[PDB]
Design a protein around this ligand. Structure first.
Ligand SMILES: Cc1cc2nc3c(=O)[nH]c(=O)nc-3n(C[C@H](O)[C@H](O)[C@H](O)COP(=O)(O)OP(=O)(O)OC[C@H]3O[C@@H](n4cnc5c(N)ncnc54)[C@H](O)[C@@H]3O)c2cc1C
Ligand SMILES: Nc1ncnc2c1ncn2[C@@H]1O[C@H](CO)[C@@H](O)[C@H]1O
Ligand SMILES: N[C@@H](Cc1c[nH]c2ccccc12)C(=O)O
Ligand SMILES: N[C@@H](Cc1c[nH]c2ccccc12)C(=O)O
Ligand SMILES: [Cl-]
Lengths: 527, 527
């Protein structure tokens, strides 16, 4: 035995520099860490969207205040994903089509639905809706956010005070750079810029060393594969199978760019947009004076050329002239994330389309779990197996949630939208849908206190997709229960007094619409 | 087909009047509830021990102040279970044998272990123990309670202020009677004294009505089976299989009585005792001026006559003339707790020996789950299946935990203690043990805040047997990890600073021991 003394991280980029920073912090002064990465053709900054626990689980762990990193990474704010045109037929367009007297949009906001008499607000909304007491959409009824986001309001007042839960939009290249500087200058991580040419394994099949193009040899007790979709160590050297999951997710490709934006004329949207297309969907990630955008599509339904044309047409770009990243993804996860002394982190481990902003989350969630299940040199098999279980659940739950965005869309207008209805939901997901249709909450949060949830990683990891999230997406798409929760007919006092809860939301919608600065005004001050 | 209009509860006792009270409260004014019970030969009050969520999940739900019910039921206080003679060979005796320089006892107390730098105190204790920095037992190192329980201290100061988490000892008959008065007088529950003679089912297999010995016919939409081990409705009428769990639990019998106690001469113990015997264990449940006591034993290893002698000799009672309850238990659970329109609640549903004070908890836990999954007359099968899943798990996790008390005892002195080592642990339990031996937390609480835990039934129910409970019992019996958590060697600042955490336990131990009144002194004032 003996403790792990030496760690080698293969791969720079976002996953590698997060691994370096997180492990550098968690093990400070008790492990020697080297990061090895090949300088290679850089890509356009197409923007990344994130979730609130980035600050609480990751940057707060490193001891880095939000102000410091967000200014270094020219970050903007995200209060929701705005799902546009998921219910209406037609071409890929940036503009919401008309549906039932209003624009075809719904929001998936941060935070938790309020409990009223032990029951989530969603259930009272649906009861009122089903019985014809309201025609208001779920999101406008139950959340203060949709009204303020429509007006492009800031989540913070000019004095700094926070009025809602929020996360960040940034170019991931800037965060990687920031973290490289942090790990190397403050945590003692050694940075080697060289290309892996050969991986030597021992008779147990564990990694012994890595040899580079220059002939340099690096050994370690633990190897962290951050090599991206290649899986240099986990797939290639350790021969661990990748599990494709295109039986749940048709999308496997993207064409992506960055588009200049006049924030003075137009303001800045405090949300990511997920814009439904003919054969996939397009993201819009507003940053400072630019937005990142990418058409995520299914290569089985659109050629690369059709996707390039569709995408450029929507943003009025010239396909001959616009800088484009064309990407084919690996969709799914390794059979096992950690094998022997090789732990995969980032896209070497797993990947799903960025429909719910989970990419960066999967990196620091895995790093949290790695540290929790941290081995010594005997590599206790129970630690590895438990870590692998946490990763497979983290990923599979997300794969299911995302499939549900396509599966329950009402659209039948293209081969793509119809083909989605013909895939099967995983058993676990079918069960959640059955519960939802019976009027049950799905993974209701133990408390409705958002600070408990976003302030405690263990609490959020156990309840990652919660009832609020399922209702936003399912009810947004138009999937609703077969009938109201049977409980509510036995609670006349509760269904009466819930009216004040809805009034309270209406009050916050009105007062925040009147008092909040624009996101653009706040960003100018903040940066 | 419409809301449930009528509910018939079959069976009184504790489970039936809890069901009546809880449903009467939950559905007040929107369902007609009748409880049907035949008068039966009454038993000696042999005592019941409970857990803190009795007040917060049951009596607080009903609107009943702790002071009110406890004075009506002549209740005492419980701070822990004290396990006596589980590690040493010999006869069934009320006196602890010597082990390693002190008495053979350990405590399973209420509360949660403190987290230090994200890691439960248990892990720091074991690190120190393993490296020979301490020989102090786990319970004495990590809990303030053992010291004050050794001195029979009150959990409340004379001014009423609470210094620890605690629950109750009482004669269950007094609680059943208190609840009968409450439900009939405050909640409009109809009480009918009659004996079920016939259960009429329809062609869907649902119960239509029950006919009594007087010829009265009681119909309802939902039938609650609180008939006890007989399972009048769920087993006899609905023919639901009962799963015997004697491959995990050998104890199936008890002989029990009540002993007068002079509390002025001797004081009152603020704990349940669980006293290891040759072929089982004996409870001691202090009440006011008396204790309830019962030898739980395996009919495979002792005859009724033998258990009677061992039990009576322990307490110096005449086996020929002492009033005794001779009980054969039905150990295990139904394949399904709820079938068609018939829900089992209490021992008609499931039973395990009272080794961890779960019997009353299983009643209001299931009642909370019933209201959560409450049907209308269409009896949506998803509600029933999900309720059944929550009940299976609540029971099977308790079965597993209880089995571990016998399986990990070091005793080999009687056929009984040896035979327990020849049984298998369930897969899910073996997995927990594997994790524990690897130095992992088992079901670490999301938070170490006991108020959030005991004040939020969802939080507690999802994490019912937590890391604290596993360490009290496993480490108490002497099962410890193979090696310290490998994480800790990378945390030299945390393993240094945890000394203040152990020192604070020691300060609370000393200060509470010096300032607390006896349990008996507080009870005189309280009652
Ligand atoms: C289309 C797209 C959109 C996304 N959108 C979002 C989003 O909105 N929100 C979000 O949170 N996440 C998003 N993500 C996920 C996120 O971008 C990634 O997890 C992360 O930012 C980058 O992945 P990575 O670091 O694992 O891999 P990579 O960036 O591919 O890094 C690979 C590294 O490995 C090194 N390497 C490989 N082979 C060798 C070798 N032979 N020798 C030496 N070095 C080697 C490379 O040099 C490089 O340093 C998105 C991802 C994609 C693909
Ligand atoms: N045949 C029956 N009719 C009515 N109540 C019953 C019957 N059998 C058992 N019970 C009730 O179940 C409880 C036993 O724990 C008692 O209230 C008892 O009256
Ligand atoms: N637990 C996550 C769920 C989530 C992931 N991506 C999201 C995007 C929008 C809203 C919620 C989410 C959160 O509330 O942060
Ligand atoms: N979650 C329960 C666990 C428990 C059941 N029986 C116990 C007896 C003693 C201590 C804890 C328990 C509690 O803390 O109440
Ligand atoms: Cl993503």
């Amino acid at each position: 035995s003996g403790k792990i003394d030496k760690i080698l991280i293969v791969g720079g980029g976002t996953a590698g520099w997060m691994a370096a920073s997180y492990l550098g912090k968690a093990l400070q002064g008790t492990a020697d860490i080297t990061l090895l990465q090949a300088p290679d053709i850089p890509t356009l900054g197409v923007g990344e969207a994130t979730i609130p626990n980035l600050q609480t689980a990751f940057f707060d762990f490193l001891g880095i205040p939000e102000d410091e990193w967000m200014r270094e990474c020219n970050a903007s704010y995200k209060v929701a994903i705005k799902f546009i045109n998921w219910r209406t037929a037609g071409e890929g367009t940036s503009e919401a089509r008309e549906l039932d007297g209003g624009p075809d949009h719904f929001y998936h906001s941060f935070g938790l639905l309020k409990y009223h008499e032990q029951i989530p607000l969603s259930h009272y909304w649906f009861d009122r809706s089903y019985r014809g007491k309201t025609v208001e959409p779920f999101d406008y009824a139950c959340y203060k956010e949709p009204v303020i986001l429509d007006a492009n309001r800031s989540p913070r007042r000019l004095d700094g005070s926070k009025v809602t839960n929020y996360a960040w939009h940034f170019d991931a290249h800037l965060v990687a750079d920031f973290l490289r500087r942090f790990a190397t200058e403050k945590l003692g991580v050694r940075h080697v810029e060289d290309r892996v040419e050969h991986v030597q394994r021992d008779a147990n099949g564990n990694i012994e060393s890595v040899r580079t193009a220059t002939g340099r040899v690096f050994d370690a007790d633990l190897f962290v594969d951050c090599s991206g979709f290649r899986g240099l160590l986990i797939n290639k050297a350790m021969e661990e199978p990748f599990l494709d999951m295109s039986d749940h997710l048709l999308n496997d490709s993207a064409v992506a760019t960055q588009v200049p934006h006049d924030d003075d004329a137009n303001g800045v949207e405090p949300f990511t947009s997920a814009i439904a297309m003919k054969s996939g969907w397009t993201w819009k990630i507003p940053m400072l004076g630019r937005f990142g955008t990418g058409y995520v599509y299914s290569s089985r339904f659109a050629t690369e050329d059709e996707a390039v044309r569709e995408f450029c047409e929507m943003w009025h770009l010239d396909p001959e002239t616009q800088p484009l990243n064309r990407i084919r993804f690996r969709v799914g996860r390794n059979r096992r994330a950690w094998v022997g002394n090789c732990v995969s982190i980032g896209t070497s481990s797993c990947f799903v389309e960025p429909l719910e902003s989970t990419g960066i989350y999967f990196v620091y969630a895995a790093l949290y779990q790695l540290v929790k299940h941290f081995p010594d040199k005997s590599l206790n098999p129970v630690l590895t197996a438990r870590f692998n279980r946490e990763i497979e659940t983290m990923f599979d739950d997300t794969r299911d949630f995302i499939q549900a965005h396509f599966y329950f869309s009402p659209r039948t207008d293209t081969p793509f939208w119809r083909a989605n209805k013909e895939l099967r939901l995983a058993d676990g997901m079918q069960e959640k849908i059955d519960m939802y249709r019976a009027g049950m909450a799905i993974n209701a949060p133990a408390s409705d206190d958002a600070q408990l949830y976003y302030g405690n990683f263990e609490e959020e990891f156990r309840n990652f997709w919660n009832n609020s999230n399922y209702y936003c997406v399912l009810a947004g798409l138009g999937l609703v229960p077969d009938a109201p929760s049977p409980r509510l007919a036995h609670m006349p006092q509760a269904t009466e007094s819930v009216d004040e809860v809805f009034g309270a939301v209406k009050d916050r919608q009105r007062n925040l619409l009147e008092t909040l600065p624009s996101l653009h005004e706040f960003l100018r001050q903040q940066h």
